[model samples]
Target: HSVPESIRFGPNVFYVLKLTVETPEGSVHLTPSESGILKRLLINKGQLCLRKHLLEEIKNHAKAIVARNVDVHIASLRKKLGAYGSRIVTLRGVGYLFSDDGDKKFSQQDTKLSLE
Candidate 1:
């Protein structure tokens, strides 16, 4: 399968194969799931990516996944994205969108991570 090694979303840049998301502060390692989720969002950035599409992308890298699981990934990714995290907005009853413009709202609150 073909996957991008890097992606630019908002002010943050993600190096997928390297498993790191970069911000002005520095960089943070991405979990495999986080990498997968962000890749799909970046590829379809500036548009709406339905929940099902996200789940399918995760399934390509994982099994037994659910919508809640996607939400969890997004929760972690937002933090790694820093200020840009606010760009990933959630469309209730619809899907998620990655946009630089203030066109939507991201309701997923941050969740503490144990990453080192």
Candidate 2:
């Protein structure tokens, strides 16, 4: 008789962060300064705010950031911030926005990015 295989599982905690992507390309490792920008992005709530808008929002603490990096970080953040509730929306030629699950809107123009 053959023995059945055993399955092992471990506990994992994930923390979602919001940030203005400032890189031309997205990557896994981020600088401390970049992280600070992300931290602020997660906290700021506004109407139609973009990357530059956020840089100004937390300028006192976070140094000035390029719009490219800000946008790239935003893309990275979307992958980490998953679930049906959290999401990142690209406004084509415009910018990006972070919305909670309950507020998610699936429109023809709204593209969905799932980290899973």
Candidate 3:
């Protein structure tokens, strides 16, 4: 898969690229796990990213550490993303997806859907 230097997602257009998030606030650094997760999400933007797949990928990047809770990593990612955090949506019982169009389309699918 081809990876871009930057990933622009959401309404305000925050960028998650190069191990950092470019937000209106400033550049926020991400942990190895967070970076990996974000990269995968961006790469598969608008598509479902299974929780199992995410865990496997993160584990591959982590040697001394083991990642278990997908939700934990996602929660931290959301916090760092701030307003643009909404761009990551949970598909309940399925997985997650980074909505490039923000919540515009996903919102219509599930009213109760949220990243947090």
Candidate 4:
């Protein structure tokens, strides 16, 4: 609930106010689990979002129900986001990330190529 009003991922947009993901077709309302997880990933974009770290955001029902819930959310989020879903990359047992440090580091590289 404390997250920014919006986080932009390429062309996709997440709106905290309504817990909606702006999709090509329009938008979709996020479930509570997805709202929490999406906000954390958006806030920590391009950083490692550990499985356990994700647990706290969802504020799980119990430890016994931890990891699987995280995975299921991750699974469903993939489908929900469509092509943009590929932005959430899994790292085996370690965690997940928004991207390969995504668009930040390559800004200059693209410029140099455009000049040539």
* Tens digits of per-residue lDDT for model 2, 15-103: 22422222335423344344444455344322245756665654665453544545555454445432311333556666756442232
Q: Sorted on lDDT, highest at the top, how do the candidates line up?
A: 1, 4, 3, 2
Candidate 3 TM-score versus the reference: 0.59
Q: Of models 2 and 3, which has the larger TM-score?
A: 3
lDDT-best of 2 and 4: 4
Q: Which numbered prediction scores highest in lDDT against the true structure?
A: 1
Instruction: For each candidate in the order shown, give its overall lDDT on alpha carbons.
Output: 0.61, 0.40, 0.57, 0.58
- What C-alpha lDDT does candidate 4 achieve relative to the native structure? 0.58
Q: lDDT score, residue 3, model 3?
A: 40
TM-score for all predictions? 0.58, 0.36, 0.59, 0.59
- Regions of candidate 2 where Cα sits further than 4 Å from its true position: 1-30, 45-47, 64-69, 72-88, 102-116
Listed per candidate, the RMSD to the true structure in angstroms reads 12.5, 16.0, 11.2, 8.2
What is the lDDT, from 0 to 100, of the residue 25 in candidate 1? 93
Model 1 bad stretches (over 4 Å):
1-5, 9-12, 22-26, 63-68, 101-116
Looking at model 1, the pairs that clash are none
lDDT of 4 by residue, 71-98 (tens): 6776676665544456677788757776
Poorest 10 consecutive residues by lDDT, candidate 1: 100-109
lDDT of 1: 0.61
Clash totals, every prediction: 0, 14, 0, 0
